[PDB]
Design an enzyme around this catalytic site. Structure first.
Site, PDB file in Angstrom:
ATOM      1  N   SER A   1       0.825  -1.209   0.000  1.00 59.60           N
ATOM      2  CA  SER A   1       0.000   0.000   0.000  1.00 59.60           C
ATOM      3  C   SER A   1       0.861   1.263   0.000  1.00 59.60           C
ATOM      4  O   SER A   1       1.524   1.566  -0.991  1.00 59.60           O
ATOM      5  CB  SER A   1      -0.952   0.007   1.197  1.00 59.60           C
ATOM      6  OG  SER A   1      -2.022   0.912   0.997  1.00 59.60           O
TER       7      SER A   1
ATOM      8  N   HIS B   1      -7.098  -5.731  -1.029  1.00 59.00           N
ATOM      9  CA  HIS B   1      -5.983  -4.821  -0.781  1.00 59.00           C
ATOM     10  C   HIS B   1      -5.002  -5.456   0.199  1.00 59.00           C
ATOM     11  O   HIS B   1      -5.334  -5.668   1.370  1.00 59.00           O
ATOM     12  CB  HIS B   1      -6.508  -3.492  -0.252  1.00 59.00           C
ATOM     13  CG  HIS B   1      -5.437  -2.480  -0.001  1.00 59.00           C
ATOM     14  ND1 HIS B   1      -4.683  -1.928  -1.013  1.00 59.00           N
ATOM     15  CD2 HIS B   1      -4.989  -1.924   1.150  1.00 59.00           C
ATOM     16  CE1 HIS B   1      -3.819  -1.073  -0.498  1.00 59.00           C
ATOM     17  NE2 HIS B   1      -3.984  -1.052   0.812  1.00 59.00           N
TER      18      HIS B   1
ATOM     19  N   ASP C   1      -8.559  -5.093  -5.460  1.00 52.25           N
ATOM     20  CA  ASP C   1      -8.075  -4.016  -4.603  1.00 52.25           C
ATOM     21  C   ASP C   1      -8.941  -2.784  -4.845  1.00 52.25           C
ATOM     22  O   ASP C   1      -8.927  -2.214  -5.941  1.00 52.25           O
ATOM     23  CB  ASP C   1      -6.606  -3.731  -4.901  1.00 52.25           C
ATOM     24  CG  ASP C   1      -5.918  -2.959  -3.791  1.00 52.25           C
ATOM     25  OD1 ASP C   1      -6.524  -2.009  -3.251  1.00 52.25           O
ATOM     26  OD2 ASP C   1      -4.763  -3.304  -3.459  1.00 52.25           O
TER      27      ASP C   1
END
Ligand SMILES: [Ca+2]
Length: 558
Positions: free
Chosen positions: A180, A483, A447
């Protein structure tokens, strides 16, 4: 390497010189070997050094500094390791070296020297209640520069200095792993400071994080027509636009349309490109009865509302302005938007754009949560702090012709725009590749924070600017994965082993072994598959158990 060498780094008359004179050490303690537990690998005897660099006061009156924690094992493989951050950072991790992928072992458990940072602000100190809580660091322009690039550069230079001082020699190779926000860091390292790290793993990277708030505003305004009910401030309840059962119906239609496009029906859409061209929820059918998915009359538990399919289609298209210019990118359809294992539905996708269903208020990340707050304070210039109760309405009146310009804008003491200090869209990786740098990128198809197609589009531009890019950089898209983790896919993998084998020894990852953390999505006890370098997908060999990598190879899409 001893206890006395560990404590001599705690200032004193010792000759530990820090690259930045403003470095202050708080802790320098010798730690004993921690035996392995049921959820973590054994940590060896190591020296823990904790400190801070560049203690100052921001223009908002708040104190700022760049914290670091450093663990140096007594038995050292001569390698350096830095783990990336998450969210807006602001917290100092245990500094054991998370390698991502739901792995038991840590970098320190593998005898790496590990370092970590907080990004240049603390979530305990820089919590201003008038500046949307823990994103309040965005009020000081230098705190933005530290969150962008400065803090990671400063901590890397200090970590190598201490490693060289404690071990009497420089680290052989340096490795970075982040998901991320930490994935945006890893790409930023390869562009701004190619000389720092030899191997880099960047997962679900937000290399266009200032744009996520624009997509978040598009998401909210696209789903609001489908929302049912109002919250305490008269904002539509975006969480009520789709029930968890509704999302499962959508992921089932994607499965009925695209699962076999890779050659095998297995609950996994391995041919993502063929799905984007084939799937359209306005025309697809519900595989559970052969009837169409879009409702013809009144809504039922077997159909989606025509107002619902329109809303989700607009959201997945991506934000645009009146001039038609794409402000971010379009999102990919994938089966990982839902998922039912045992009792629990998958929340790993709807928690970004929609939020939890059984809530009388908005709680989506992109509607009122951290993501929308972060864009208002950290990514927009000038920053616009406000009460938390007004963030949802600010995303409802978002004007896509005036407001998107704030991520390129500059004003006053905010001398650099957010896309300038946070962006990592560069494809100038020549200096990184030519000194031996290797980079592995991975991204899940489901995601909802960052678009996997956008990562693929950057990887395409990199291959265009640098022919032969697969010699130093490969992208491993993961189907069904949400994610950073979760969802109906193989989201567990060891990426530190291939990364080391690429930088040194020169072994390019033709595939990466991966398994599912929640195999109950497919109703099996375990499922292992190979992750394939872009644009290759996993191809079933034709026989054997479909839950074993040995029966799968990496091939060009059918
Ligand atoms: Ca399949």
């Amino acid at each position: 390497a001893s206890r006395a060498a560990c404590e001599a780094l705690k200032d004193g008359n010792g000759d530990m010189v820090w690259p930045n004179a403003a470095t202050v050490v708080e802790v320098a303690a010798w730690r004993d070997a921690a035996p392995a537990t049921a959820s973590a690998a054994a940590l060896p005897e190591h020296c823990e050094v904790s400190g801070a660099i560049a203690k100052r006061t921001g223009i908002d009156g708040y104190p700022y500094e760049i914290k670091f924690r450093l663990r140096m094992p007594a038995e050292w493989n001569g390698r350096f390791f830095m783990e990336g951050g998450s969210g807006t950072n602001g917290s100092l991790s245990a500094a054991t070296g998370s390698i991502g992928g739901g792995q038991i072992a840590s970098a320190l458990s593998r005898n790496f020297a590990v370092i970590a940072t907080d990004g240049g602000h603390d979530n305990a100190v820089n919590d201003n209640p008038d500046a949307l809580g823990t994103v309040a660091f965005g009020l000081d322009p230098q705190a933005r520069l530290d969150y962008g690039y400065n803090s990671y550069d400063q901590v890397t230079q200090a970590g190598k200095a201490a490693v060289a001082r404690f071990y009497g020699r420089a680290a052989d190779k340096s490795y970075f792993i982040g998901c991320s926000e930490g994935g945006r860091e890893g790409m930023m390292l390869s562009q701004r400071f190619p000389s720092h790290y030899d191997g880099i793993v960047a997962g679900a990277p937000g290399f266009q994080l200032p744009k996520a708030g624009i997509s978040g505003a598009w998401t909210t305004q696209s789903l609001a027509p489908a929302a049912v009910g109002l919250d305490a401030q008269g904002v539509p309840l975006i969480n009520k636009s789709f029930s968890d059962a509704d999302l499962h119906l959508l992921s089932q239609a994607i499965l009925g349309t695209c699962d076999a496009l890779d050659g095998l029906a297995d609950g996994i859409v391995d041919n993502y490109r063929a799905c984007q061209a084939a799937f359209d929820p306005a025309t697809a059918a519900n595989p559970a009865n052969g009837q169409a998915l879009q409702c013809v009359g009144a809504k039922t538990a077997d159909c989606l509302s025509p107002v619902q399919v329109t809303a989700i289609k607009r959201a997945m298209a991506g934000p645009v302005n009146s001039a038609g210019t794409p402000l971010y990118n379009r999102w990919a359809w994938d089966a990982g938007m839902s998922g039912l294992s045992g009792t629990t539905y998958n929340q790993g996708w709807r928690s970004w754009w929609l939020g939890s269903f059984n809530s009388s208020a908005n709680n989506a990340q992109r509607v009122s949560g951290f993501s929308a707050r972060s864009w208002l304070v950290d990514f927009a210039t000038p920053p616009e702090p406000m009460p938390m109760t007004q963030v949802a309405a600010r995303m409802m009146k978002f004007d896509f012709d005036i407001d998107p310009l704030k991520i390129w804008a500059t004003s006053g003491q905010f001398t650099q725009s957010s896309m300038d200090w946070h962006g990592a869209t560069s494809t100038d990786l020549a200096a990184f590749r030519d000194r031996g740098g290797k980079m592995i990128l991975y991204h899940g198809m489901s995601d909802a924070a960052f678009s996997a197609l956008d990562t693929a589009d950057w990887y395409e531009r990199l291959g265009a600017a640098m022919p032969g890019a697969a010699g130093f950089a490969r992208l491993f898209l993961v189907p069904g994965m949400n994610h950073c983790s979760g969802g109906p896919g193989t989201d567990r993998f060891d990426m530190l082993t291939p990364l080391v084998a690429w930088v040194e020894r020169g072994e390019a990852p033709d595939q990466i072994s991966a398994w599912s953390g929640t195999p109950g999505y497919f109703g099996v006890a375990a499922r292992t598959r190979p992750l394939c370098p872009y644009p290759q997908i996993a191809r079933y060999k034709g026989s054997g158990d479909i839950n074993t990598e040995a029966n799968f190879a990496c091939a060009a899409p059918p």
